[PDB]
Structures are given as C-alpha cells and as structure tokens.
C-alpha cells in the first residue's frame, strides 16, 4: 500500500509514535518518506552484505527481522520479514519502536542523518490535523 502523507501521519499518531523515545512524529514521517516513499511493500536487496531492507521503514534483516537467507542474522523484533510487508503497519511500527530503543535511536537509519537531521521537518505533518 502507498500511503498518502496525512493518512500516514494520523495512523502513526494513533499507533503512539508521536514523541516515542524522544522522536517527534515529523521525524518518523521524514524517515518513512525517504526510506520507502510511504510504500509498505518496498524491499531492497543489499548485494554487498546479503541483507534486505523491508517495508515502510526499510528495516534490515540482519538485525531486526528473520528472512532465513541473511547470514549471521538475529531477529530482535521476533518477526518474520514478511510481517513488514503488510498493508497494516502495526507490526512494522512495533519493530521500528524496538529499533530506536537501542542507543543510536533514530540515527540507526543513515537516511535520517542525510535527509532529516537538523532540517525543518514541519512540512511532513503540516495540515494533517495531528
């Protein structure tokens, strides 16, 4: 499913992402935008290390979910990577909460540093009523 900006904003707020571990809703919106373009079925194979990024937040199979073919991988979210490809983002959200519970927080995603950090991210939630 490809979410529309404000639709996603409201959904994430209902799932309790606003301010989760110090992370504002607009930061989560900026992250989803740059990681998948708000697309829940987005996948990206990393030939360099044999891992794959799954879903709206492009969560990696080496550390977060299990896909069976990633070498030396753990499954910290205790989920099959298939779960991060559903139109219902409840599981992808639960797993992203798990990711930021680690010391790096939101910084775990390099795309956040490149496109969101220190920027005016207000535009991602403007006019959405959240």
């Amino acid at each position: 499913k490809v979410f529309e900006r404000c639709e996603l904003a409201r959904t994430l707020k209902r799932l309790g992402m606003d301010g989760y571990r110090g992370i504002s809703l607009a930061n989560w919106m900026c992250l989803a935008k740059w990681e998948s373009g708000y697309n829940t079925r987005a996948t990206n194979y990393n030939a360099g290390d044999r891992s794959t990024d799954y879903g709206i937040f492009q969560t990696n199979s080496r550390y977060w979910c299990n896909d069976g073919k990633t070498p030396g991988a753990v499954n910290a979210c205790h989920l099959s990577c298939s779960a991060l490809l559903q139109d219902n983002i409840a599981d992808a959200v639960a797993c992203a909460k798990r990711v930021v519970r680690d010391p790096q927080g939101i910084r775990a995603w390099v795309a956040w540093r490149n496109r969101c950090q220190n920027r005016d991210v207000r535009q991602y939630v403007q006019g959405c009523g959240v």
Side-chain angles (χ1 to χ4, degrees):
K1 168 186 190 179
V2 179
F3 278 83
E4 301 210 283
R5 188 174 58 94
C6 294
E7 179 195 3
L8 181 61
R10 293 189 289 267
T11 299
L12 292 183
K13 191 171 198 307
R14 196 166 48 237
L15 298 178
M17 290 291 256
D18 200 10
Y20 188 84
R21 295 284 290 170
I23 306 157
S24 72
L25 186 61
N27 274 295
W28 288 115
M29 287 295 293
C30 184
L31 178 73
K33 154 64 174 56
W34 294 107
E35 291 297 345
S36 64
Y38 312 137
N39 184 2
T40 65
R41 73 123 59 192
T43 53
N44 192 74
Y45 183 61
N46 306 303
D49 84 314
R50 303 186 160 193
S51 75
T52 304
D53 296 325
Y54 296 92
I56 198 153
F57 296 119
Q58 286 291 272
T59 298
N60 197 267
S61 62
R62 181 163 301 288
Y63 314 95
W64 315 106
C65 62
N66 179 44
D67 67 357
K69 55 168 170 58
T70 305
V74 288
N75 184 8
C77 289
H78 303 123
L79 290 168
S80 164
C81 296
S82 182
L84 310 177
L85 297 175
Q86 306 176 74
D87 281 2
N88 184 324
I89 66 171
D91 292 327
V93 162
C95 187
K97 285 179 173 175
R98 170 62 188 86
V99 174
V100 305
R101 227 175 285 144
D102 269 12
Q104 290 192 260
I106 185 70
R107 288 160 165 72
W109 285 274
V110 177
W112 182 81
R113 277 130 68 161
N114 303 348
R115 3 270 317 200
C116 309
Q117 181 179 185
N118 301 148
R119 301 189 191 241
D120 188 353
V121 297
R122 285 182 169 80
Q123 63 168 259
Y124 298 100
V125 298
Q126 289 311 261
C128 304
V130 300

